[PDB]
Design a protein around this ligand. Sequence first.
Ligand SMILES: *Cc1c(COP(=O)(O)O)cnc(C)c1O
Ligand SMILES: *Cc1c(COP(=O)(O)O)cnc(C)c1O
Lengths: 369, 365
Amino acid sequence: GHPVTLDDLPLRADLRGKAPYGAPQLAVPVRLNTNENPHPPTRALVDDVVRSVREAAIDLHRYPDRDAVALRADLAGYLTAQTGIQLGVENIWAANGSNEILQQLLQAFGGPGRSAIGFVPSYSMHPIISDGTHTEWIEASRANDFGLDVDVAVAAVVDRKPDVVFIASPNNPSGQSVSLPDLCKLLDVAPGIAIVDEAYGEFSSQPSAVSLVEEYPSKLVVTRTMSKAFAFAGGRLGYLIATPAVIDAMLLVRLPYHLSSVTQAAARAALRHSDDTLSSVAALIAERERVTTSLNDMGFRVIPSDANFVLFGEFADAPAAWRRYLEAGILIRDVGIPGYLRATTGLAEENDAFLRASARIATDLVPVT
Amino acid sequence: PVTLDDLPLRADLRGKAPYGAPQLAVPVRLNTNENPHPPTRALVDDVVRSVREAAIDLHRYPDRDAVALRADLAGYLTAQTGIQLGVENIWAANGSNEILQQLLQAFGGPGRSAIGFVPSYSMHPIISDGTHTEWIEASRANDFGLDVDVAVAAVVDRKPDVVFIASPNNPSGQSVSLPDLCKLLDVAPGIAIVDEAYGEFSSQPSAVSLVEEYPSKLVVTRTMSKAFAFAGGRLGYLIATPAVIDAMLLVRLPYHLSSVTQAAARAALRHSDDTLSSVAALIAERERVTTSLNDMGFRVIPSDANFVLFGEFADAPAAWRRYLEAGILIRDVGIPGYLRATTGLAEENDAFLRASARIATDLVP
Ligand SMILES: *Cc1c(COP(=O)(O)O)cnc(C)c1O
Ligand SMILES: *Cc1c(COP(=O)(O)O)cnc(C)c1O
């Protein structure tokens, strides 16, 4: 007769009529819509991953190291070297992407009866994971320049007393880092925890927010990923930096053995080539400034970025423009900001192609006053 | 320094301890139900080669929907059970743990409840708790098997949104009969999750054959951690009507399954026949252990898996410590008078048995 549908299943009412996350598939020539490193791993990196996976592969019949100690120590070491801030294993917690880190953090510190705040436009997954963990999502507005409006942000935290304060720095999708003084103002008033999502920290010209953990150990958690600068999006590894008591809190919410032996071994291999991979950052940053200068030169408004992408406009109709970029063979991202789109910084050839299409597409800019 | 108490942790996480036995140094480990046979060079080479291929593009995000893996999973289980399954019917995640978490997210959670029939699997209450699904218990029979009248009555009475059934059961090893299963499915108002982690060991048909009959209710879970000897890769999956997969897409964290995890697991599946050729030998060992334990005075619950619940100790935790002192690590599952011994290599079973001969003197007369 009729196959059973989702309507026929006893799904939660609060999940009814919702669509799954994710843009539909597209294998088109130029993809600059997810903030991936465009430089594939080097042969030497691939060999080290492979050798580390081969080593662990002989004991696949056994459960992996539950607490992933060696990985966490290697993350501590990388980040110590990277920021001059002294960190060890006990300050680090890892999981399958930042997504899972955020989920774990909201289970421990948000969840039912609790709330989280974001300053918008910011990162799409923050409200989605809040929703997923049944944490109330609250919004306050960034400034007209897309940067933080710190008085508005502070007033909202004071008024609403959210359990979790989200701050993305460099922000996605505008690319702007939050100044440390703005950060400290929020930290001062946040009553629960603050999560500073430093997914783009490696690309940024200002100190890591890990420098502040010592100053705010009962509130501050910093998150990083291996998905962007580290060119390890395929391996799904994110981590957090905090006071050791936060690690104990993660042990209460994490699914035991969440990190596989394969994943732990591969990530360790990626970290042993950190210097090799992060050498790119220089070139990507250069390319991002070349793109920015060229778009500016052509009459586009471009938000200055501290990350590996660019938010730019102002289109009279941003989705129409996004469709035109598509017709030219360029996949960039519509992040739901009226009049703006977000273009990931790619290989030179890909950026050249983005710019060539933008030259033609500049005719759909809002006319000037 | 700040402690966990000084953090603004949820009130309902206070007083809780992290899940997991500390990973101790002992010569014979028979406390987690892993397959004791390491992978062959043929399997390892395939995994490595497949991961190398995946490693070339680690800069890119993986297949979101893990399509080829799910289809291979459907191929395996089709050939295994004779029940025609497609990619349509399969969802995979990082272990049954994440499978269970996702199911509870979609079908359990705040305001809703789950029931278990005890003693059974420790992670069912833990993942219910973790998803804020209320946890309800009804007792199994004295023989550790299901008491179907009590189970059915508790489901009718409490109208749980999720009914957990472990089959074969952990820790008793007992499969739930198809008729008992059908009685609970009939009364279940929401969904029933049949956790079929030990299905490869079981002498009875998989519950997947019932999905056709209860498509709006029945979800079956399976794992690669046990018979499949792939615990280290963390890969679990469910089998259900295609609409349940659509539900999983609403709760899953996008890109939850790494490109590396997908390639490794697909490689392991290409060697399923060879890996699973140990099943018969493991069962033979389990039966030998059972007989030997019986001959020494122990009571052993008949098992349909790769372990044995046995007793009756005057002091089961104390007994667990004797085994430990004797070099043998089994599992205390918190059942007074009983302990759980995984079936391992012949040598390991002999050592367990050898220790069991002296520890027999601690048995209730
Ligand atoms: C891309 C991005 C991430 C990365 O998520 P993973 O799960 O680590 O891939 C995290 N946070 C922000 C703000 C991002 O833009
Ligand atoms: C061992 C076991 C599992 C396996 O869990 P994974 O997360 O897949 O390793 C699942 N269910 C039961 C009842 C078990 O005993």
